[PDB]
Structure 1
Amino acid sequence: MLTLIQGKKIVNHLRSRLAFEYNGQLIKILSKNIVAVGSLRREEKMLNDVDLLIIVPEKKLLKHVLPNIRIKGLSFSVKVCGERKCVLFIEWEKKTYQLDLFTALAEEKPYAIFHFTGPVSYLIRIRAALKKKNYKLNQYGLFKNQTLVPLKITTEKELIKELGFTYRIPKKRL
């Protein structure tokens, strides 16, 4: 549908035009909390849809960016995807595409980026892998016998060593 260039051009502008409506007020967001997922992180050439990751550093703003969040006067449709995911239908050049954005906590930063950069297949392969050790890896942390355990990392390469795994690339899969 869209090429690597397209998705890059839009997101580049879109991450500088993004904002959210808090308490009725308008609050712009900075690209610092906006990462382009999909062909951009998978190093592909032509995607089918564009994914986007937005991290929030507050235990408030994390859920207050959820009510109203969007661009300034554009053609989009805000719908709910799954349980916690969100999807928007934007229109460009008289065409309509699907935008899937994901908002998470700063503490989940390494967990989320890794999750969205690697192949789902590998992720489960890792899920069970951890269960075998009596561990459940979720986006909110690590569950040990129903006991949630927090993380002590914030880097993509720190998370892998903290987990005891090697960094993988979607390009090769698993």
Structure 2
Amino acid sequence: GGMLTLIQGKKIVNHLRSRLAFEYNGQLIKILSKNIVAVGSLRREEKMLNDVDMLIIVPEKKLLKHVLPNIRIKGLSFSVKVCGERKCVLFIEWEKKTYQLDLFTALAEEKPYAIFHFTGPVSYLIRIRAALKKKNYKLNQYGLFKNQTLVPLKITTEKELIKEMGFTYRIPKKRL
């Protein structure tokens, strides 16, 4: 896929926000825009993008079988590259040129951890996880674990989560 200016990327996301659905036992379920979070370099406001990234919050676990494996896009032609229950990669045709689209899934109780994970950047994410590792924790896109056990942080947002683990909050674009 080609390179995208930040604003080009914001147009695709805006366009797609009302246009993703999934086929669920024949029926065609539309995905709410309130349940889509733009992530990746887009969310970090980088000048140029290699991917458009969209994290989908799925309401109930039983749907992971159905959302990305049956994902559908109103209007737009595209091909599937790789796809599964938690990561789908699509090459969308958009104005006589093709770009790469990464859809990811998180459940509701994983939401902050997933936005944290997928917002990146990779450098920022490694150095944080290295420090928690040294304190015998593990952090991924689903939770914080100690002794192979979820740590039930009483948090809801990314901002709260970041601070609850012992880090200051930075807007997405100042993460490094």
Q: Write out the 4+ residue segments of structure 1 that deviate beyond 6 Å after TM superposition.
A: none
Q: Which segment drifts farther, 13-22 or 160-169?
A: 160-169
Against the structure 1 CA distance between its residues 39 and 127, is the aligned structure 2 distance closer, same or farther, given a 3 Å change threshold? closer
Q: Name the count of aligned residue pairs.
A: 174
Q: CA deviation at 1:134?
A: 1.0
Q: Which segment drifts farther, 142-151 or 90-99?
A: 142-151
Q: Is the 8 A contact 1:118 1:168 kept in 2?
A: no
- Residue aligned with 2:159, SS: helix
Q: Is the 8 A contact 2:114 2:142 kept in 1?
A: no
Q: Is the 8 A contact 1:136 1:142 kept in 2?
A: yes
Please give the alpha-carbon distance, in whole angstroms, between the structure 2 residues aligned to 1:103 and 1:120: 19
Q: Is the 8 A contact 1:18 1:72 kept in 2?
A: yes
Q: Is the 8 A contact 2:85 2:105 kept in 1?
A: no
Against the structure 1 CA distance between its residues 160 and 51, is the aligned structure 2 distance closer, same or farther, given a 3 Å change threshold? same
Please give the alpha-carbon distance, in whole angstroms, between the structure 2 residues aligned to 1:27 and 1:99: 20
Against the structure 1 CA distance between its residues 21 and 139, is the aligned structure 2 distance closer, same or farther, given a 3 Å change threshold? same
Q: CA deviation at 1:67?
A: 2.4
Deviation sequence 1:56-98 (CA, Å, 0-9, x none):
1212224421320120243111232699421001101221111
Q: CA deviation at 1:173?
A: 4.3
Normalising by structure 2, we get a TM-score of 0.87
The equivalent residue for 1:140 is 142
Please give the alpha-carbon distance, in whole angstroms, between the structure 2 residues aligned to 1:79 and 1:39: 20
Normalising by structure 1, we get a TM-score of 0.88
Which blocks of at least 5 consecutive residues in structure 2 are unaligned?
none
- Residue aligned with 2:61, SS: coil
Between the two proteins, what is the percent identity of the paired residues?
99
Against the structure 1 CA distance between its residues 109 and 149, is the aligned structure 2 distance closer, same or farther, given a 3 Å change threshold? same
Q: Which segment drifts farther, 149-158 or 15-24?
A: 149-158
Which blocks of at least 5 consecutive residues in structure 1 are unaligned?
none
Q: Is the 8 A contact 1:108 1:141 kept in 2?
A: yes
Q: Is the 8 A contact 1:81 1:87 kept in 2?
A: yes
Against the structure 1 CA distance between its residues 38 and 119, is the aligned structure 2 distance closer, same or farther, given a 3 Å change threshold? closer
Against the structure 1 CA distance between its residues 8 and 103, is the aligned structure 2 distance closer, same or farther, given a 3 Å change threshold? same
Please give the alpha-carbon distance, in whole angstroms, between the structure 2 residues aligned to 1:129 and 1:82: 31
Larger RCO (alpha carbons 8 Å, 6+ apart): 2
Against the structure 1 CA distance between its residues 120 and 75, is the aligned structure 2 distance closer, same or farther, given a 3 Å change threshold? same
